[PDB]
Design an enzyme around this catalytic site. Sequence first.
Site, PDB file in Angstrom:
ATOM      1  N   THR A  44       0.796  -1.210   0.000  1.00  0.00           N
ATOM      2  CA  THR A  44       0.000   0.000   0.000  1.00  0.00           C
ATOM      3  C   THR A  44       0.841   1.279   0.000  1.00  0.00           C
ATOM      4  O   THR A  44       0.675   2.205  -0.761  1.00  0.00           O
ATOM      5  CB  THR A  44      -0.884   0.029   1.233  1.00  0.00           C
ATOM      6  OG1 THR A  44      -1.737  -1.131   1.225  1.00  0.00           O
ATOM      7  CG2 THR A  44      -1.704   1.333   1.371  1.00  0.00           C
ATOM      8  N   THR A  45       1.850   1.261   0.889  1.00  0.00           N
ATOM      9  CA  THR A  45       2.776   2.351   1.022  1.00  0.00           C
ATOM     10  C   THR A  45       3.589   2.540  -0.268  1.00  0.00           C
ATOM     11  O   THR A  45       4.044   3.680  -0.537  1.00  0.00           O
ATOM     12  CB  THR A  45       3.668   2.167   2.286  1.00  0.00           C
ATOM     13  OG1 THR A  45       2.817   1.974   3.398  1.00  0.00           O
ATOM     14  CG2 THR A  45       4.551   3.393   2.565  1.00  0.00           C
ATOM     15  N   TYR A 107     -13.240  -2.955  -2.960  1.00  0.00           N
ATOM     16  CA  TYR A 107     -14.317  -2.360  -3.726  1.00  0.00           C
ATOM     17  C   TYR A 107     -15.468  -3.382  -3.901  1.00  0.00           C
ATOM     18  O   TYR A 107     -16.645  -3.029  -3.635  1.00  0.00           O
ATOM     19  CB  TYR A 107     -13.858  -1.780  -5.091  1.00  0.00           C
ATOM     20  CG  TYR A 107     -15.028  -1.058  -5.758  1.00  0.00           C
ATOM     21  CD1 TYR A 107     -15.293   0.219  -5.394  1.00  0.00           C
ATOM     22  CD2 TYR A 107     -15.913  -1.711  -6.572  1.00  0.00           C
ATOM     23  CE1 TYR A 107     -16.322   0.953  -5.921  1.00  0.00           C
ATOM     24  CE2 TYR A 107     -17.029  -1.038  -7.075  1.00  0.00           C
ATOM     25  CZ  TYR A 107     -17.224   0.299  -6.731  1.00  0.00           C
ATOM     26  OH  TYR A 107     -18.305   1.053  -7.176  1.00  0.00           O
ATOM     27  N   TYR A 133      -3.660 -10.134   3.873  1.00  0.00           N
ATOM     28  CA  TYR A 133      -3.639  -8.740   4.308  1.00  0.00           C
ATOM     29  C   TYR A 133      -5.023  -8.260   4.450  1.00  0.00           C
ATOM     30  O   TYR A 133      -5.780  -8.190   3.458  1.00  0.00           O
ATOM     31  CB  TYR A 133      -2.738  -7.971   3.396  1.00  0.00           C
ATOM     32  CG  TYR A 133      -2.615  -6.476   3.561  1.00  0.00           C
ATOM     33  CD1 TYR A 133      -2.937  -5.821   4.729  1.00  0.00           C
ATOM     34  CD2 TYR A 133      -2.107  -5.741   2.500  1.00  0.00           C
ATOM     35  CE1 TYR A 133      -2.775  -4.416   4.802  1.00  0.00           C
ATOM     36  CE2 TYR A 133      -1.963  -4.385   2.538  1.00  0.00           C
ATOM     37  CZ  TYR A 133      -2.312  -3.730   3.719  1.00  0.00           C
ATOM     38  OH  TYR A 133      -2.154  -2.365   3.804  1.00  0.00           O
ATOM     39  N   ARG A 138      -9.719   0.427   3.972  1.00  0.00           N
ATOM     40  CA  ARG A 138      -9.435   0.632   2.576  1.00  0.00           C
ATOM     41  C   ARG A 138     -10.274  -0.201   1.586  1.00  0.00           C
ATOM     42  O   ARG A 138     -10.446   0.200   0.462  1.00  0.00           O
ATOM     43  CB  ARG A 138      -7.995   0.381   2.305  1.00  0.00           C
ATOM     44  CG  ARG A 138      -7.023   1.327   2.991  1.00  0.00           C
ATOM     45  CD  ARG A 138      -5.612   1.121   2.551  1.00  0.00           C
ATOM     46  NE  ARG A 138      -4.648   2.130   3.146  1.00  0.00           N
ATOM     47  CZ  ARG A 138      -4.504   3.342   2.701  1.00  0.00           C
ATOM     48  NH1 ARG A 138      -5.157   3.766   1.606  1.00  0.00           N
ATOM     49  NH2 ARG A 138      -3.629   4.143   3.284  1.00  0.00           N
ATOM     50  N   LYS A 161      -1.138  -9.998   7.702  1.00  0.00           N
ATOM     51  CA  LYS A 161      -0.836  -8.606   8.046  1.00  0.00           C
ATOM     52  C   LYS A 161      -2.173  -8.092   8.435  1.00  0.00           C
ATOM     53  O   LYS A 161      -3.122  -7.969   7.612  1.00  0.00           O
ATOM     54  CB  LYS A 161      -0.346  -7.832   6.827  1.00  0.00           C
ATOM     55  CG  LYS A 161      -0.096  -6.399   7.076  1.00  0.00           C
ATOM     56  CD  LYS A 161       0.343  -5.662   5.826  1.00  0.00           C
ATOM     57  CE  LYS A 161       0.437  -4.154   6.012  1.00  0.00           C
ATOM     58  NZ  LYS A 161       0.896  -3.527   4.758  1.00  0.00           N
ATOM     59  N   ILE A 203       4.485  -4.767   9.659  1.00  0.00           N
ATOM     60  CA  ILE A 203       4.766  -4.275   8.380  1.00  0.00           C
ATOM     61  C   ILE A 203       4.459  -2.792   8.379  1.00  0.00           C
ATOM     62  O   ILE A 203       3.274  -2.411   8.527  1.00  0.00           O
ATOM     63  CB  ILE A 203       4.002  -5.030   7.241  1.00  0.00           C
ATOM     64  CG1 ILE A 203       4.551  -6.454   7.132  1.00  0.00           C
ATOM     65  CG2 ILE A 203       4.164  -4.280   5.972  1.00  0.00           C
ATOM     66  CD1 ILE A 203       3.755  -7.414   6.286  1.00  0.00           C
TER      67      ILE A 203
END
Lengths: 292, 292, 292, 292
Positions: A44-45, A107, A133, A138, A161, A203
């Site tokens: 993501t980062t 989504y 994850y 999000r 995660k 993480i």
Amino acid sequence: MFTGSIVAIVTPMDEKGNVCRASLKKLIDYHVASGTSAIVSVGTTGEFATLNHDEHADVVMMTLDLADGRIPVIAGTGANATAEAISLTQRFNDSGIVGCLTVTPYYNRPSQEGLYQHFKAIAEHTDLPQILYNVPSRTGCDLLPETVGRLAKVKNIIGIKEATGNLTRVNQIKELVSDDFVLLSGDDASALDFMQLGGHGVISVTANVAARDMAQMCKLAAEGHFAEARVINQRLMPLHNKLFVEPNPIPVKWACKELGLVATDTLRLPMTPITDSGRETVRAALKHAGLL
Amino acid sequence: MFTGSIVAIVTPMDEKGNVCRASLKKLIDYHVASGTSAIVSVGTTGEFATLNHDEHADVVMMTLDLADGRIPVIAGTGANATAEAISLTQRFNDSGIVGCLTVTPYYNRPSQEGLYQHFKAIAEHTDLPQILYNVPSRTGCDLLPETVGRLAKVKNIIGIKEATGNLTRVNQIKELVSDDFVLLSGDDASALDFMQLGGHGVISVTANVAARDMAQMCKLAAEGHFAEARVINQRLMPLHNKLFVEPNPIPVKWACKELGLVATDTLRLPMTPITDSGRETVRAALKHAGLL
Amino acid sequence: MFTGSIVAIVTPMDEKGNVCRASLKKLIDYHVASGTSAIVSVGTTGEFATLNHDEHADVVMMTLDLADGRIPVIAGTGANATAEAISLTQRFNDSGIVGCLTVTPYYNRPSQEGLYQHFKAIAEHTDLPQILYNVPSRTGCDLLPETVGRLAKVKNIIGIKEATGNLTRVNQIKELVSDDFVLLSGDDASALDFMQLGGHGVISVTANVAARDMAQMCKLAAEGHFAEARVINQRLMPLHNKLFVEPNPIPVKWACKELGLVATDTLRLPMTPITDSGRETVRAALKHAGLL
Amino acid sequence: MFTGSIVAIVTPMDEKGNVCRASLKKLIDYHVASGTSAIVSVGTTGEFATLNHDEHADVVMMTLDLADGRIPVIAGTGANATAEAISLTQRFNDSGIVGCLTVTPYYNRPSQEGLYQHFKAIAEHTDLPQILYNVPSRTGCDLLPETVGRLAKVKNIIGIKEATGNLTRVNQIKELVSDDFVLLSGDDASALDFMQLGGHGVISVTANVAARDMAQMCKLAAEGHFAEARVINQRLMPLHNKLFVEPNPIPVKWACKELGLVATDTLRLPMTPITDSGRETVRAALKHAGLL
Ligand SMILES: N[C@@H](CCCC[NH3+])C(=O)O
Ligand SMILES: N[C@@H](CCCC[NH3+])C(=O)O
Ligand SMILES: N[C@@H](CCCC[NH3+])C(=O)O
Ligand SMILES: N[C@@H](CCCC[NH3+])C(=O)O
Ligand SMILES: [K+]
Ligand SMILES: [K+]
Ligand SMILES: [K+]
Ligand SMILES: [K+]
Ligand SMILES: [K+]
Ligand SMILES: [K+]
């Protein structure tokens, strides 16, 4: 390596939004020197959403090349379409990555059965270790402990995660999985609490700029020295919060530029440049952590 | 057509998961016959997340071909990377579609300034009319009224599909935009309420299977005949709710198959087949609506 | 005593809704025999809302009389009007209670400054130790760690019963207060996690029916033997959940009747009798815990 | 009067915290002069939580005396114990008040069956008309439409004050009750929207300081003149919001003092005096409304 301080590394970009090899090299050398356990590439980062598949693969491969065996690389391989996730995973098979970080579909809001089939299918078609994850804020969906327990029976699904920030998940998941399944925080501000409850590492966004302190915090936690770890955490807490004062990775890329670790703080739309007020908040947090 | 009963049409598939042309043609002819105002092709209910761009474009173009000028076609063109949204929109420039339905970026959680820049950039690369689309439960982002005001100043940003289910948004937005900006519900269960407050129509899941009833309800609403519209609404309320008993479009595809409108109820992973309990719930709702 | 397993004791009632001295005696003897640390009298579980002030005091005094020095008693003294809280506190001064459990004002939603002035005023007018009580799901307000830190400077404010279930609060509060300030969980299902993070015990509903297992769990936790404690917790987890299957204390009073600890399961309106489905769920949980 | 602009009147106090008769008289005369439809005496805005029952009854009876038949008076009679609600209601039997505003029990979180039994028992002990009152943000309980239907069958349960701000509730409730059951907004900022959907009026905080404007807005709404009503609404929107900048009734009491309608802005703990920043916000809202 799937324990300790694992950095969710920024994808440094030039002014055109293309990956900056020289900046990436400097980051990677920094992580090697600072004791980071592993590098998550294009998480993501690392702005997975705004790289296309070719660019995403390019960045993972460049990170492996630059790491040159000195630090393990885990690739972001998530997608919201199961075929796409399989496809991206195949690009990394025999690349040198040690494992994959695969987000719950975003989504489209699949059921728990949909999540089970999604991850089962992806795991089936690789021999790479998979780290699930979960980040409901999000994605719009929440991979529940019961489903994690079902998936942990799949041989190469090896950890999770967990980015809810809901610390009750640690032991709900732990009781359903084998002792060797890895529990990693995806929420820097609650990560030390997460490890104290039985988690194995983090993480981390904060690790991008405070790699040594993060590595020492996670080692102290792993040894049971939580009071000692918590002193470090309290110096990092303003960064754990203020690296999200504007959308991640806006703040952390600015911080990396301010420290000289990357040449430019450029991101891809819809991420936009840091505000002035954000620069000032982030700078104060860096100072609190003793980094500037 | 950007008012009245607008169907978010399913992308009907064969057992292999590819678009079924005969089924699509049957649907489209159904909507022409029923008085549906417009078709949104490859929106959320059309499975935009699990088609590749080429597949997505093929479905839009097939729908346009089959409509054969009888009913206006709005293309789903959303993406969570601005470059990708621009690319997809450019596929439809000079195509025959009447406008575009473009969702706020999902997963990456941009700021409101990011949303403004994303939609502005997309609108700048087309002459087609743009309908913004806000659905925070799926995207993790909420396009607030103030930002919708700011975007409504861009010439070809002409409306919004508001899928929060938060009816205070109707008049909040209406007071910030011109009288010709269109407000459409994205939430079937509150859509009559939404029109009662000032909205202009609905982009609907229910219209896939109750197209005549939806069109009659929306016409009554537009005329100010709310009590008569509510009788129809009450007959459709179980579908408005139970079409989300499992994740959309799992229930509506099954319902379409049960009614003989499509050949198979196949979807793409991570969407999975309807459960037996789901089938019974949806069949009860269809019977309530007098459709079965 | 302000550590370990503290029971939020039911107020047992006859069929008329009046306090049953004989049932209360049997409970108190049970807690003394089973190693419970202390008894919270007329807390939430003791139906403070539906006793008037005289009855509330009567129950506290009867509990002290029956305890006869064998177990410490903490009185519920909360109110949503600061004058009322002071007034109720004065009734207990020199009663033999060891301290007071005082809830944040409910319904009226005071500011943090209002909470600070409320609790400061109450503490000023007693020499009894005060344990603050935060339970936002009931009260509509949330006493934040910053305000807890302000209040912990008041000499006789000595701890907090934190019932958010949000485990991040443990260490947020701990870092702002002295080492001798007591952190107690008010959420049975997360209480062991709460202690693992640095909490000192729990003010418990489950302890009403599983007093020995709760006492041993909290001792193991205090000694650092969390894996051992967690075995106990997993046998209790269905009770920690299903004692809230209908509004507390509906389930726990039924459970106490089923075990023979109280003569009747009667409550005061607006609490109503357990449903049949609730009896069956509660019974299954008691069996899981090995109590029937 | 159970329609139109109904003021939830402040309980004006002297510096000691006791009811100020001269201030109450000034307010009441203001509401008569302004065209307010009815007065709710000792509702939430009237500080019911911090008056004792005798004090509460005295304020109601003083308000009734001062109204002198000019304007109808509804008494706040809610409690979270059914026995106590019955007691309070019985104080007003044969008094001159026109009906009762009775909140769902707060803090104790009864079930829907509990809510049904609570309100049924209260209605059985009076001939006065009962307005139910739902405000889950304060009470921790949500009286759902189905239960409101069930209660609307009781002869003297005649309406609901719906303070969720969730406008879907208007038509959900309307379809379950008779045409003469009254729906009133408890949420000033959505109240015009609420009336546009079918509601009959508002029990308002804003009417304390903009009584003429509120009465004109509600009359326009009742007539179907929504656009004209919205102009007034827009002028009052900053008050509708900023009267909650600090906890109600802190801002509205200050506003009343600033306008010369009451002698002092004193409240009872745990409500505390308005902050300097609060005063400036509220003064700006009053200036927007053209009241200052
Ligand atoms: N922008 C799309 C595609 C990204 C593909 C490479 N990571 C998404 O977030 O799914
Ligand atoms: N599955 C990716 C790409 C979809 C591309 C075509 N509609 C996403 O949801 O953004
Ligand atoms: N039922 C009221 C008064 C209770 C008084 C004795 N505890 C309340 O919950 O505040
Ligand atoms: N402060 C207590 C009693 C109020 C009694 C009179 N209104 C409560 O909010 O229930
Ligand atoms: K495999
Ligand atoms: K495994
Ligand atoms: K425009
Ligand atoms: K004192
Ligand atoms: K203290
Ligand atoms: K009635």
